[PDB]
Amino acid sequence: MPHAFKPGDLVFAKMKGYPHWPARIDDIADGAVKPPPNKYPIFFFGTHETAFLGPKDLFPYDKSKDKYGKPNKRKGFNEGLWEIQNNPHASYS
Ligand SMILES: CC(C)n1cnc(S(N)(=O)=O)c1
Asked: Which terminal CB of the chain, N or C, has fewer other CB atoms within 10 Å?
C-alpha cells in the first residue's frame, strides 16, 4: 500500500497552464523557507524552479510515466525528462 509523500519521491507535478511536469519532492534545508501547511516543496526538473503543491497535483512517476513522460515543446521540459530518468537525486544547484 502507498505511504504519504516523502522527500526524494519522483512525480509528475501539475500546475495551471503547464503539462504534467517531471519533478521531485525536495527536502527543506536547515535555515530554508518552509512550505505552507499540507504543501510539499516541488522541484521541477529542467527549469529547476520550485513551487509548493499539495497531493492533488502530484502523480507518482512510475505509475504515470507512460502517460506523461513524452517530449514537449515547453522550455526545459525535455531537459527535465533526461534528469528524472538519468540523475533524479543530483544537486541541480
Ligand atoms: C512558478 C512558475 C513560473 N512555475 C513553476 N514551475 C514551473 S515549471 N512546472 O517548472 O514549468 C513554472
From this structure: N
Q: Tell which residue, 26, 23, 13, has the closest CA to residue 85.
A: 23
For 21-27+38-86, CATH number out of 3.40.50.1100, 3.30.230.10, 2.40.50.100, 2.30.30.140 equals 2.30.30.140
Residue 24's identity, in one-letter code, is: R
Experimental method: X-ray
Could you identify the residue written with the cell 507518482?
Answer: 60
Please give all residues whose beta carbon lies within 6 A of any atom in ligand 1, as ranges.
15, 18, 21, 44, 47, 49, 51
